[PDB]
Structures are given as structure tokens and as C-alpha cells.
Design a protein around this ligand. Structure first.
Ligand SMILES: Cc1nc2cccc(O)c2[nH]1
Ligand SMILES: Cc1nc2cccc(O)c2[nH]1
Ligand SMILES: Cc1nc2cccc(O)c2[nH]1
Ligand SMILES: Cc1nc2cccc(O)c2[nH]1
Ligand SMILES: Cc1nc2cccc(O)c2[nH]1
Ligand SMILES: Cc1nc2cccc(O)c2[nH]1
Ligand SMILES: [Cl-]
Ligand SMILES: [Cl-]
Ligand SMILES: [Cl-]
Lengths: 159, 159, 159, 159, 159, 159
């Protein structure tokens, strides 16, 4: 009945993302983990890779649905019959950008309510960007990623 | 099914608060607007005034319950069987303090989720303290308050 | 007599920019809207496009002069006999970068005073970057741009 | 023609304030240095002390007028026929509070423009409160104050 | 050879403080844990209580010296022949205020270097004030304090 | 005996960097100025150029060692037997990113203590990026760079 969308680039999905979507499923009946194509960010993993990684990483959560999209997130939320948009908040830079996004999304879809969750202390200082940078220099990021994602990141960089 | 609390001092309740609680009622089945006694900040309105003002200002919202409390926010939420704690986010200063409170509340009550809502642009720059400061110095705050609150504030300041 | 420069990339000029330059004209006798070439930012519109867009968008303001430039803004301000440099302030990230810029410009031209204006609430959460991103995904940005700019942005993306 | 007000508590006026008001006088025809009674913060110097100190410290500026006021900043600016309100910006904490005040002042007096000036690097880390705190604890604040203010502060602290 | 001071009110000392001072002892030969009398903030524990609590809580650290002081931090560091001043950084609000203090301390004592340490994620969201606030309102703060401090806090709050 | 690493891209090294490393040498017995290859940032100067520039710029400091590296900084610090990692803190954006880095480095090398220094007021608003931008537009940056670096930057841009 209550449907929420959790959009992001998820390049790749981290334990921080896993924490947020898990909390979302404890709050709403159905959660769409929505992976934006984000070509402007030149992602390391293709959209199809990121969807598969997230599907495996969230298979244990019964009310999570992983979908990729290139639409405007506001339209995609409407077309998923979502009335809640989930984002995790990490730092001041996040907050300020999320504010901009939320006000734009409110303009585009006024009945879509943006709600923010604060991550666990364990994940409050990591990001996909940071994890990739450490991995690019062969540092150990097993603690920060789902097993399947760590394998795929290692495999990716080994090529 | 989902019970949420929206705690604060509400000294007095503003249109920013009304915006946040209205958004909350569109998200959750039952919202407790929880008014802290907050003696340490020496509020302008008494607790009984603040509760009465907030009840009148939210009477049109069918699933809002206005309740006073003097306990720790987490203790009151636990006793009310609430699993969601609503907070509005205004500025960076908000965010950092709310981050603190959220991590403390997660420690005190792990089954309580803190969710942050974003106010309309219309109310993004006001607070109870700013409204009181302007009104005390003979500025016009009509636009920022429910009618009943505006009347009570004028009466208060006329001493 | 009092001459001010309002420099920026204006890729493209938004209603937020229009608000700032309009306020500038209410404060100073002559305002130079100065469009930096900004090749490092790889702008969507060429400098000649951006100048024409801004000229049309500000034609109703009698004391606005639109000029493009690739010089150091401090030298360009001196060569325009400007003693005030206008910038609009939006978020914390803006403020911190504008501070850096102002201190550098003060080093380069000590008699050029940098003054900052805060935008209307309506435009406090938009930017050229955000508007382009929404438009790239076919979202409606008519509310955020001058008519001529919206047409040109639509036309640009339709190719 | 252009009348600007520079309001504050100036308890006491520092070289940071002198820097800001000096820059203002180079921008606008007439600058009112407006000293708030500010009883709620319990100032160290009385209003008559603060006005006298500021007058002496700005006597070399021909187009500065030092005036005390107890009204709302917007009410005083309106009554003084000022169309510019000067504020100095120091840090992020400044910025966010000044943003609030600016939006409130625009609501209260739309014909009043808030303009923000940036202090010299020399004064970017001081405030009246910090200076008083250092001086009270037997630290050297000579570098941060006009001579007349430094003398009065020593006299005050000798009690 | 290197003497460092770690000043604060420590009202009361928390596991965050213990973390910072422990890291300091691993960096410098001798660390003075300097407890400010700080009457202006009206501390919950007296100075003699705060010193006694901190001594017990740091007895396992061989190169820590706990000392009370009522002078300016810079004056005390000079008199203790310390050339390093330790401060912990928690949030953005910390950072900006510490930046101020550091620039003032460099002016007052140029031969004193301010170094900023970062607390563990475990303690990154707590402070003495937050701990007192939670404990006063019947919240569990056992995890955040040394055992001896927890006992003294309970005793204090039982009044 | 006490060994510290000061890592960064140093593209090119500025007087701000010189201030930080100089302060580091006043605090620790041996300082490794470590220049990260940073190919993702597409540096203006090659690693070998940046090392030579930094060597010349720090030749007057007896206990500075300039080394380039492409390793993970945490591993490089271990392999240099460094137990302190120095970073200068400039703005809020710096602080938030440095926090992320420090927590990651603590995960990778728990006995490596990250310590932050606040730069002199003179250099608190400059960066390699800003200096390059001014130089690209033929503005005078002699005040911000060591002589040898200014020459090399001029030479670079003259080609
Ligand atoms: C892909 C995408 N970028 C956006 C930016 C703002 C609002 C939206 O709905 C957006 N969707
Ligand atoms: C009254 C009150 N102060 C708090 C501080 C932290 C957490 C809480 O739940 C609190 N409740
Ligand atoms: C194009 C341009 N970038 C600048 C950076 C700093 C100062 C200036 O005057 C600048 N002009
Ligand atoms: C004394 C005073 N407090 C204010 C708050 C907001 C706006 C104003 O103009 C104010 N004046
Ligand atoms: C007690 C005290 N307040 C201070 C403020 C600035 C610098 C210092 O060294 C201080 N010490
Ligand atoms: C080159 C490099 N990037 C890093 C990011 C995090 C930690 C490290 O140790 C790093 N080293
Ligand atoms: Cl209380
Ligand atoms: Cl007052
Ligand atoms: Cl004190």
C-alpha cells in the first residue's frame, strides 16, 4: 500500500546503501531501489551491472524491487505509484545538494514526499567514490561492500 | 499501523511546524505531535498554552494527536509505541545537531527510526525563536503563524 | 557614476540570475552583466549564445549592459571602470568558494569591492547545472528560465 | 542619494567593524552605523558607551552617522529612509543566520536590500565576543581594536 | 621532549575525551590534560570533581598529567612550556569555532601549534552537554562514559 | 624517531603547502612530503615535475624528504615507518572530505594518526586549483607560490 522509491547511481551499491534500503523496508510496505543510468557521471559499472549487483545484494529483503531507469526520477516515481522518495544523508555537501533536489522534485511532483535517513555510524564516512578510489589502489574494501559487489569490483579492476 | 511522533517545544507552533506535521500525516497512519515541557529554555508560552494552540492549529488533521510530555524523547516514543520520529530539517546547523540527536536516539531506542522532512521554501528560513524575536520588536509575523497562534502572540506581547 | 559588474558563466542565465541583476540595478547606476567564457567548465551554450540569451532576458532593464569576456575578471572589472563586483549567494558551498574568489580578487584589485546578494526564496535552490539536468531528462523547467532561454534550451536539447 | 544602514550591537566595535563600515562608505553616499540597545544579550558596554566609542572610532569617515536604536532593524531602516542594509559575513555560521535574517527583512521591508560584505583576512576570525573573552582572561587584544576602544576595555576590565 | 596540552571543561570527561587524549599520548612525550575552571558556563561538576574524575579515568596513561587552570589557554600553555595544543574536531560547527580559536591562539602565542585530532566514529556524535542532557532526562549514557564518571553522574543526578 | 607523512597532489606546491610542511617540521623529527600521482585529477604537472618543484621549494628545511608515490597512501605511510599523517585544513568542504579520508585511513592503518593543521590567515583562501585558474588568465600569482614554482607555472602556461 505505501510505496517508496530509493533512487541513486549505486556505482556500486555499498553497505551504506544496504543500511538505508533496509531501514526503508522497515518503514514502508514496498521499496523500489531505483538505479539511475547517470551517464554524466561516467559510471564504472554499466546500468545492467549495477542492477544485477543490487538485486543480489538485496535478495534477502522480501519487499525490495530493483529497477534501473533513465527517466526523470520524479516521473519514474509517479510511474511506480510511489509517494515517498528515500535518500540517505551523509555530510553537509550531501544535505545541501539533497535540499536542491527535493525542492526541484517537489516542483515536479508535489505529492512525492522526500524523506531522509541518517546512516549508521559504521557507514557515515564512506561512499561509492571513496571505495572505488581505495580499491583502485589495491586497498581492502571488503568491510564496505556486499560480498557479491566486492567480487565484482575486484574482478572489474583486475581487467 | 505506523505510529510516528513529531516532538518539539513548539513555542509557539508556526506554519513551518504545520507544514511538517501535515506532510507526516500524509505518510503515516497516526502522528503524535509531542510538545516538550522544555523548562530549561524558559518558553514564552506555558505548556498548556502550547498544547492548546497546537490542537486548534491541527484540528483539521484527522490523524494528529497533540500530547505534552516531560520525558526523554526516546522514552516517550517507546511508551507511545511509535516506530518513527519526525524531524524537520532547515539549515546546515539543523542538520549537524539532528545528526547528533539521531545517533543518540538510535543508541537509546534502536527500534525507533528518525526520518527527516524538508519544509516548503515558504517556511525554510523561520523558527519559533526568530518569529518571537521579530514580534517582540514590533515586526509583522502574521504570515508565519496560524491565526489562533497570531492572536495569542499579540495578546501575550501586549502583556 | 557607480558602476558594478555581475560576472558568471550564465550557462544559461536563469531566473535566479535575473533576480540578482535586477536587484543590482536597483542599487547601482550601471550594471555590467559579464559572461565568462569558462572553457574549463565545457559550457552547453557558446559564449555568443549566452550573451545573446542574457541580452534578450535583460532587455527590459535600462541600466544593464551584457558583455562577454575571457579576461581575468579582476582586470575586466578595472577595464569597465567598475568598483563593485556582484555575486549571488545560494548555499554553503557557494559561500566558501565565493570567499576564496573575493579574497583573490581583493589581492588583484583592492579597490574592487565584492558584495553579495541573497536570492529570493523562489530561486534559492536552483542553478544552471540543476536546470540543465532536469531538462536533459525532459522535465519541465519553464518556471525557472526566461522565456527566450527556455526556448533555446529546448531547441538545444532537441538536437 | 543612496542611504545604507550598518546595524549591530558593537559591544565593543572592533577593527572588523571598522573595516566593514569603511568599505560601505566607499560604496554608498551615506552610511548610518546603527547601534542596537540589545538588552537581551546583556552587553558589556552600555549603549551610551558603545555609541561614544563608535563615533570616536569612525570620526575620520565623513559620511558615517552613528545612531543608537531600540526598534526592529527593519523599522529603523524604514524610518531612516535607508534602502541598503549592510552585514559582514565571517563564517558558515554567520552565513546561515544572515540568510534567515535577510529573508525575514525582505518580508518586513521589501524595498530594503541586504548586501553582504566580506572582511579582510586580518579580521576574518574575530568577533566582539571573542575579543571580550580573550581580554577577560588576560589575553592581548590590542591588535583587534581601535585605540580608544582598547583603552575603554582595559578600564572596564580593571573594574 | 614535546609537551602538549589538551584543554577543555571536561564537564564531565567522556569516552570521546579519553579517545583524544589517548591518541595524543601516542604522539607526544608528555600530555597535560588541562581542565578549565570555566565558571561562565556554570558546569555541572565542580573543578575538583572534574579533575578527580579525569585523573582516575586516565590513570592508565603514564604520560598524562591532569591539571586545573583558570588562565587563558595560551597563558597556561606558555607557562607549562607546551608547544602543542590538542583539540578534537567533531562537526562543522566545531571546525569553524576551532578555526577562530586557533587563529587567536597563534596571535597570542606564535610558538604554540594547534593540532586537531579526529575522534573515533564511536564518539563522533557525543559531547559533555549531550550526555548530561540525556542523563538528566533519564536516558542511558553508560556507553559514553568511563565507569568512574558514570557512577559520579548517577550520584549527582540523584541529588 | 617520530616520523610524519604529508601527502597530497601538490599540483603545484603553494605557499600554503609550504606553511603546513614547515609547521610539521617544527613538530616532528622527520617529515615525508609525499606527492600522490593522482592521475584521476589529470594534474597540470607530471609527478616528476611536482617532486622536483617541491624538492627545490623545501630544500631549506633539513628534515623534509620529498617522495612521489602511486601507492595507497596508508600503505605508503606504513612503508615509510610513519605514524602521523599531516593534512592542512582550509574550508568546510576540506574538513568533510578530510574526515572521510581519515576514517578510511584509520580502517586501513589504525596506528597511523591523522593530525590536521590550520593554515596561516595569509594562505587560508588559496589552493592549487585557484592559483592555476588565475595564472591561466594571466593574473599575478607571485605572492602565492615559491619562486621556482612560479617560474615553472609561467613557463608551463607560456607553452
Ligand atoms: C535523473 C534526474 N535528475 C533529476 C534532477 C532533479 C529532479 C529529478 O526528478 C531528476 N531526475
Ligand atoms: C528531551 C530530550 N533530549 C534528548 C537528547 C537526545 C535524545 C533524546 O531522545 C532526547 N530527549
Ligand atoms: C576568469 C577568472 N577566474 C578568476 C579567479 C580568481 C580571480 C579572478 O579575477 C578570476 N577571473
Ligand atoms: C532587533 C531585530 N531583530 C530582528 C530579526 C529579524 C529582522 C529584523 O529586522 C530584526 N531586528
Ligand atoms: C579561556 C580561554 N578562552 C580563549 C579564547 C581564545 C584563546 C584562548 O587561548 C582562550 N582561553
Ligand atoms: C591514493 C589514495 N587514495 C586514498 C583514499 C583513502 C585512503 C587512502 O589511503 C588513499 N590513498
Ligand atoms: Cl529541559
Ligand atoms: Cl533584545
Ligand atoms: Cl569563564
Amino acid at each position: 500500500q505505501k510505496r517508496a522509491i530509493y533512487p541513486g547511481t549505486f556505482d556500486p551499491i555499498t553497505n551504506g546503501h544496504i543500511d538505508i534500503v533496509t531501514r526503508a523496508t522497515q518503514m514502508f510496505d514496498h521499496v523500489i531501489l531505483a538505479i539511475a543510468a547517470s551517464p554524466s557521471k561516467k559510471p564504472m559499472f554499466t546500468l545492467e551491472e549495477r542492477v544485477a549487483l543490487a538485486q543480489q545484494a538485496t535478495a534477502h529483503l522480501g519487499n525490495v524491487e530493483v529497477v534501473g531507469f533513465s527517466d526523470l526520477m520524479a516521473n519514474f516515481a509517479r510511474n511506480q505509484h510511489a509517494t515517498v522518495l528515500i535518500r540517505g544523508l551523509r555530510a553537509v555537501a550531501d544535505f545541501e545538494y539533497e535540499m536542491q533536489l527535493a525542492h526541484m522534485n517537489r516542483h515536479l511532483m508535489p505529492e512525492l514526499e522526500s524523506v531522509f535517513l541518517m546512516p549508521s555510524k559504521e557507514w557515515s564516512f564512506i561512499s561509492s567514490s571513496l571505495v572505488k578510489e581505495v580499491a583502485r589502489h589495491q586497498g581492502d574494501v571488503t568491510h564496505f561492500l556486499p560480498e557479491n559487489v566486492h567480487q565484482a569490483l575486484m574482478a572489474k579492476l583486475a581487467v
